[PDB]
Ligand binder design. Sequence first.
Ligand SMILES: Cc1cc2nc3c(=O)[nH]c(=O)nc-3n(C[C@H](O)[C@H](O)[C@H](O)COP(=O)(O)OP(=O)(O)OC[C@H]3O[C@@H](n4cnc5c(N)ncnc54)[C@H](O)[C@@H]3O)c2cc1C
Ligand SMILES: CCCCCCCCCCCCCCCCCC(=O)O
Ligand SMILES: CCCCCCCCCCCCCCCCCC(=O)O
Length: 567
Amino acid sequence: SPVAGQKYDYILVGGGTAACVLANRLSADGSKRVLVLEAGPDNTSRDVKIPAAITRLFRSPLDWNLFSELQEQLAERQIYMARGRLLGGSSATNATLYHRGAAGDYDAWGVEGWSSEDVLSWFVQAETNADFGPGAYHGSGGPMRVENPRYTNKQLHTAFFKAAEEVGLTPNSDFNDWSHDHAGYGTFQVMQDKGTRADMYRQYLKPVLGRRNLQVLTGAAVTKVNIDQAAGKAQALGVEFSTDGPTGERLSAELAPGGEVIMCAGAVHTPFLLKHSGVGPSAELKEFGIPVVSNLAGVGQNLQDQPACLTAAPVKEKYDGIAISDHIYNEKGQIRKRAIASYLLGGRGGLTSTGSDRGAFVRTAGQALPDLQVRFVPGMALDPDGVSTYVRFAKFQSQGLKWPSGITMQLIACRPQSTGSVGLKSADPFAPPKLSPGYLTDKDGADLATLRKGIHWARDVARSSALSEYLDGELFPGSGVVSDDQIDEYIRRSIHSSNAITGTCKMGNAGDSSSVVDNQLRVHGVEGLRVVDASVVPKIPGGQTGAPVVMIAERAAALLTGKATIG
Ligand SMILES: Cc1cc2nc3c(=O)[nH]c(=O)nc-3n(C[C@H](O)[C@H](O)[C@H](O)COP(=O)(O)OP(=O)(O)OC[C@H]3O[C@@H](n4cnc5c(N)ncnc54)[C@H](O)[C@@H]3O)c2cc1C
Ligand SMILES: CCCCCCCCCCCCCCCCCC(=O)O
Ligand SMILES: CCCCCCCCCCCCCCCCCC(=O)O
């Protein structure tokens, strides 16, 4: 009905991080008719605008509320995997940390035309930075906003940095500068604009909603890509979707001649929807009676996510009130007047923080690149699951209680060796995906070793002069968790997502039969179908995965508009 009688040059399946970038670049010249279909609503919540309100976005109506299959290797638990459900997708719900990883991460892909030297200019193109001017590693003038965080904890941030230095870590003045080594401690830059969230809805899509050639539908849940098998195999015709959930009528948006469907549903829902479209491992599609259009073993394989555990310690009584928890809430859980005034008057203070924006990259055992990311938070976890503790922190408002003052160090396996999968547990495209993160399944136990050594490193840092001045014992993992076996059990029971998720429709070279797209991001064996999102990442870079997704979308837009070639 909203697409009755229209023809589109591009249909974007999803309106998330990548989709917002493509919607902007593909609609620019006026010539091309662009449709965006997002299952979630418009992006208007104040909980999206205010970085500290990330606490409220977890397990909210603006999240998919995905749980994994039971993981036997993780004390038989289902793992929550946060995913944004609105225009801007996970860019609208994420911790805003700005990471590209290292040059070596893109070289390790081994994909023609996607080396570190190929991708650098596409990172720089996206960027405006408040703290770095033009140079080899930074642009000015791009639609993204990046800045140094506009909250600083006076006592605890400086203490973390001195502590890191005491255990022999060097400062890294720019984690995105590929002319020096990735390892070191410092401040993560953030995708914020004077302390408001600078998500890809705000930066890319919202400014161009006026364009007559761009049509964006919210509440539009795609159910499959329409693919025809006629005189020379499989051709995308468009997309089936409902505007009224499962019971709603199945509408179809149609491509114009020469049009393309671009999958932007992200590393969870893209492979799910491809499988619902007959693109996937033929045995999985047969099991739910889906006709196989393109038998691709790689669809939903190679799921890479960066698993996390944490240590937490209270401060001494005489340091009560110095934590970010004290800067956001008073002792009866009301939002501090000062935090509201600083946010509104100057885009400063606790409300501009997602909490996790200082830390380090560490080599636990002589690896080529750091295996460990540390995220230092100047507040104390009340749960060994940091995502559960963020949810508790949002629920804590107005409860009449005092959050105890202290610190957390989150330990992430940032270059994990384990992989998971996403598939179907049903033929109904409205049912949740069969999600398995596959944490700690790698053959050598490398990921478990990374996190075990992370906990040792966090204990060494907390034992430092700099931090032991402030701290009063340890809450997590606590005195019961000392031996390697005790630490391994604690990690199995508490391991959570640091919210990356890549690689489920991986890009590959010619001859790579585990790949789903070529180096032009085209789905093997289907005409008029591309993937442009986190799904195409061959091998997860170190650090948070949002900026790499924006780099891929910018380059894909340039390829599709004829402004660039690849290979
Ligand atoms: C909680 C959290 C914290 C993170 N922290 C950081 C961080 O600090 N820094 C960082 O750089 N990265 C971070 N990440 C990762 C980063 O946000 C993502 O990797 C990135 O946003 C992915 O972009 P994408 O376009 O691949 O997918 P998304 O941005 O997730 O977009 C997918 C879109 O498709 C939509 N969709 C799904 N199914 C359908 C359907 N059937 N029909 C229509 N639409 C559909 C979804 O609703 C969504 O809007 C975080 C992620 C999360 C979730
Ligand atoms: C639980 C910790 C996060 C809570 C954050 C909520 C803060 C609410 C404070 C009241 C401020 C509301 C008005 C200012 C915000 C408007 C959003 C914006 O335009 O940037
Ligand atoms: C955003 C500001 C909230 C700060 C108050 C929280 C106080 C306790 C700190 C808990 C830290 C655990 C580390 C978890 C980071 C989880 C969210 C994420 O993946 O971005």
